[PDB]
């Protein structure tokens, strides 16, 4: 309050430069401030949520504004296969002359928007720049609304009471109904009123959306339940997305499968889809009691699930108490569920490409998947990091008297021993088989390889109709129960998309699928060995049982008792962030090298040269970095010269991380003394004396900043290589 | 004071020149009311001279260099191209060494002489710093807004500065 | 398309905003 950390007086008394860094990194740590109690905490995170949401909508209004103003959006609408989607323009004063010829696309010098945004705005039904301006203003207004609320609920009499925050009971009555159920219903109110007619040629802007019904007859003879009229005449075959030719007029037809032409999902399928998800979520909103009293008390829902089998402790009696009073448990479930949702998003954006003329630009599809996978891994590691924060700064094993959680801390030894077992097994049985296949391929003999057919994935693709394997089971067999059971409904529009080898749906599978998917499960089980380790040994280990007393990110225990480098629950974060970047590494190298074989066409280039490691370092890193690393030559440059620069730049980020990760503090803490000796002793600079005393970075910060350069270097290197690689082999 | 719904005791002062009691968004809080005053005076005087250029865009005083009468748009670009627009930043810099003498925006504002007016540029000197100050600011404020009304007349009308007033409407 | 606006906003937010914002945050350490 006096100086800097206007929030912690334990850091304002510090004369060093640690008051700055810990003043920054403990700013959002609202549970550890001067005198901020519970009401003063929820009444601050609730306002900062609004500030956050307004930052999100300021950002999306940013994309709407630059696409509205510097992009080539409607020219892209004219030819979505040919013209590249432009991002915002450039103003460098550093582009001398030869750079500008490598960026001119029309009058603009803009970047090429490799983020899939024109596809989604083209399936929404935005066919102009004018709607992008009205939308951008429509989100500047919304960000002003959210900043108004966060400023407004920190105004004192509008700061809501904590009993309102502990209406945990009824947020689920309103999120599942209002946020999820209504809005998705409202999103059908977009798709029925905008995306279906502006895909079927009818420009239904903001004028005739009440005078032109999306079905030619609607809602006066349609409370009678004659709902097959809304799925009467589908858009069958002979249609191009955007015009009115070859298209019917039904709204909610569930054909299943793709377009024949744009290789995306039907918008009738999405209108019916979000409509059904909307109805089911609105039904799920009627789940819990309120002031009315028709629902479920959550205490009666966790208290009742104590098994009389008796194996599962004294049941969940104690769990509802440690979700209301806790937050890091609730944030751990939030990041867990959001993270599995992101990985589901990533595993479906390529597999079932939703957006017209995606899977035709092979860079934006390659960036959306990798984007949501690295964000997926970040949010899992957040779920376990706040898991360990829950077990340290939030866990009460007296309200959790022999609870399910206390049972978890009881058998955490068996948990960590068996995670370490499966991780060891997969690490001797991916690396064993890749070094086997790589030695054997190296010794003039690709035949003596171990290739195991991944028959379980091939059988599961046979359960979804991929007839290219010869199992002839539930959907691959055309005479079975499920094959007849949806023979009219959605099968023949969908098995065409399955049995095709053009689309990225249910890919053809060699033993690279086997060896890589074991490598992925190695990554998941190592990363949960670490995270579940320093989330269950977050509280106390047999090295030091004092760990719960020191908080989350305490540095160490000194050299005592053998040495104690990185014992904290923050280490599990600190190490499983490397395993996060690694595991999402192998996921996206595998995906990206699978689709550089599909999109090129030579699937045999993958399946012959991916079962061993020089297949990866040869056929994928050495070959596909060739149009990258030719980004600028001593003969000139091209448009990839940004990424080939960034690539190199990112290596310089990555290895600077090692300077903090490898080489720890007491080197630098006795080197800053040489620098401060030399600054104090010299003339003409001893006048300019510091105020904060120069001190080397503390060993939680140092491992953290080395981790941050490891992430930024890693992710910028691979975002350089995805985009420069696919943008070099194509576009 | 002045604005009727009781929203008028901010950091400002009623005896300040140009006062008519109007800060709804309480910009007088946090923004150094004297510096906001000096920015209002200086914006009013330079917008005042600028709309005087948009008043004396008639045939008088075209001395041998321009030959481009009544353009008001890319005339700025015409003298970015013609040069010597950098040079008038040099000359104005040679003024603003002498005028304010502290010349840093919020750090160390030169408040010595009771009024945001520097060195007493007044060779005629028939009025002193009387309530003429009170009628300077309005003659800046109106000189601000209609100045925009000239340039927006160049923006979307784009026709002519002076040729809106007689019977000329879109 | 007001093409001149990045020639104003990209310098005045790219360089002079992390000059005066260094001043506001760094004096704001001592306020």
């Amino acid at each position: 309050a006096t100086k800097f950390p206007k929030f912690s007086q334990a850091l304002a008394s510090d004369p060093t430069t640690r008051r700055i860094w810990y003043g920054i990194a403990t700013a959002h740590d609202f549970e550890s401030h001067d005198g901020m109690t519970e009401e003063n905490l929820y009444q601050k995170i609730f306002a900062s949520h609004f500030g956050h949401l307004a930052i999100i909508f300021l950002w999306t209004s940013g994309n709407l504004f630059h696409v509205a103003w510097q992009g080539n959006f409607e020219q892209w609408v004219a030819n979505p296969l040919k013209t590249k989607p432009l991002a915002h323009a450039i103003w460098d004063p550093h582009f001398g002359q030869a750079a500008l010829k490598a960026f001119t696309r029309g009058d603009t010098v803009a970047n090429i928007s490799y983020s899939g945004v024109y596809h989604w705005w083209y399936t929404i039904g935005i066919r102009n720049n004018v709607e992008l301006y009205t939308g951008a203003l429509g989100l500047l207004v919304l960000s002003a609304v959210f900043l108004l609320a966060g400023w407004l609920h920190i105004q004192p009499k509008f700061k809501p009471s904590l009993s309102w925050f502990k209406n945990n009971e009824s947020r689920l009555n309103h999120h599942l109904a209002g946020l999820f159920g209504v809005s998705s219903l409202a999103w059908t109110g977009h798709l029925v009123h905008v995306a279906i007619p502006a895909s079927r040629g009818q420009h239904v802007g903001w004028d005739n959306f009440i005078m032109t019904p999306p079905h030619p007859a609607g809602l006066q003879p349609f409370f009678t339940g004659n709902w097959s009229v809304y799925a009467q005449s589908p858009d069958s075959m002979q249609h191009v997305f955007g015009t009115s030719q070859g298209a019917g007029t039904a709204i909610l037809t569930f054909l299943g499968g793709f377009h024949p032409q744009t290789q995306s999902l039907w918008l009738t399928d999405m209108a019916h889809h979000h409509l059904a998800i909307a109805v089911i979520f609105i039904v799920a909103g009627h789940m819990y009691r309120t002031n009315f009293g028709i629902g479920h008390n959550l205490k009666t829902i966790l208290e009742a699930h104590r098994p009389p089998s008796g194996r599962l402790g004294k049941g969940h009696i104690g769990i509802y108490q440690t979700l209301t009073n806790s937050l890091h448990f609730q944030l751990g479930l939030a990041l867990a569920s959001l993270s599995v949702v992101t990985s589901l998003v990533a595993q479906h954006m390529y597999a079932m490409p939703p957006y017209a003329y995606m899977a035709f630009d092979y860079v934006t599809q390659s960036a959306l998947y990798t984007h949501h996978q690295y964000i997926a891994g970040l949010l899992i590691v957040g779920a376990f990091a706040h898991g360990a924060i829950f077990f340290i700064r939030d866990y009460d094993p007296e309200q959790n008297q022999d609870n399910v959680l206390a049972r978890m801390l009881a058998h955490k030894e068996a948990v960590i021993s068996h995670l370490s077992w499966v991780s060891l097994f997969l690490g001797f049985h991916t690396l064993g088989l890749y070094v086997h296949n790589d030695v054997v391929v190296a010794f003039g003999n690709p035949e003596k390889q171990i290739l195991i057919e991944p028959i379980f994935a091939q059988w599961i693709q046979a359960t979804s109709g991929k007839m290219l394997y010869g199992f002839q089971v539930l959907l691959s067999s055309s005479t079975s129960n499920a094959s007849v059971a949806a023979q009219q409904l959605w099968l023949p529009g969908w098995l065409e998309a399955v049995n095709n080898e053009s689309n990225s749906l249910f890919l053809t599978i060699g033993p690279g699928d086997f060896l890589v998917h074991h490598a992925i499960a190695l990554g998941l089980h190592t990363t949960t060995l670490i995270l579940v380790k320093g989330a269950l040994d977050a509280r106390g280990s047999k090295l030091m049982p004092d760990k719960k007393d020191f908080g989350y990110s305490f540095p160490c225990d000194g050299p005592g008792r053998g040495g104690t480098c990185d014992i904290s629950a923050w280490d599990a974060f600190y190490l499983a962030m490397f395993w996060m970047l690694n595991t999402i590494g192998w996921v996206t190298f595998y995906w990206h090298w699978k689709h550089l074989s599909l999109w090129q066409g030579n699937v045999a280039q993958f399946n012959e040269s991916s079962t061993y490691l020089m297949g990866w370092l040869r056929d994928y890193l050495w070959l596909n970095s060739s149009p990258l690393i030719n980004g600028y030559n001593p003969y000139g440059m091209n448009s990839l010269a940004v990424w080939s620069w960034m690539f190199l730049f990112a290596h310089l980020v990555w290895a600077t991380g090692f300077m903090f990760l490898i080489s720890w503090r007491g080197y630098w803490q006795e080197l800053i003394e040489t620098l401060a000796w030399a600054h104090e002793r010299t003339p003409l600079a001893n006048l300019i004396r510091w105020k904060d005393k120069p001190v080397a970075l503390s060993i939680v910060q140092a491992r953290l900043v080395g981790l941050v350069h490891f992430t930024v270097g890693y992710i910028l290197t691979y975002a350089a290589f995805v985009i420069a690689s696919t943008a070099g082999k194509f576009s | 004071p002045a604005l009727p719904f009781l929203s008028k005791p901010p950091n400002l002062s009623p005896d300040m020149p140009g006062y008519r009691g109007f800060d709804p968004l309480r910009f007088s809080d946090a923004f150094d009311v004297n510096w906001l005053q000096e920015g209002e005076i200086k914006n009013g005087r330079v917008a005042m001279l600028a709309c005087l250029h948009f008043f004396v865009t008639e045939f008088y005083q075209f001395p041998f260099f321009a030959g481009a009468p009544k353009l008001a748009g890319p005339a700025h670009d015409y003298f970015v191209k013609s040069g010597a627009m950098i040079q008038i930043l040099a000359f104005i810099g040679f003024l603003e060494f002498l005028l304010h003498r502290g010349k840093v925006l919020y750090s160390d504002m030169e408040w010595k002489g009771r009024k945001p007016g520097e060195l007493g540029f007044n060779p005629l000197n028939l009025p002193n710093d009387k309530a003429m100050r009170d009628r300077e600011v309005n003659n800046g404020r109106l000189a601000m807004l209609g100045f925009a009304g000239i340039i927006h007349g160049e923006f979307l009308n784009g026709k002519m500065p002076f040729e809106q007033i007689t019977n000329f409407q879109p | 398309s007001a093409s001149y606006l990045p020639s104003i906003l990209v310098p005045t937010v790219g360089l002079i905003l992390p000059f005066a914002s260094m001043a506001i945050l760094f004096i704001a350490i001592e306020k």
């Binding site: 601050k44 306002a47 900062s48 609004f50 500030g51 307004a54 300021l58 209004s61 504004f65 509205a68 103003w69 720049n129 004018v130 301006y133 951008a136 203003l137 500047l140 207004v141 960000s143 002003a144 900043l147 108004l148 966060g150 400023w151 920190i154 105004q155 | 968004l25 946090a30 923006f155 979307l156 | 398309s1 007001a2 606006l5």
Partner: peptide
Amino acid sequence: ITDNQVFVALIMALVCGYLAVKLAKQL
């Protein structure tokens, strides 16, 4: 595609900037 809507845009996010500093100097 025009210029005046860009001015209206930076007006609305300038006001939104005033709500950003307005929220920022209370928490």
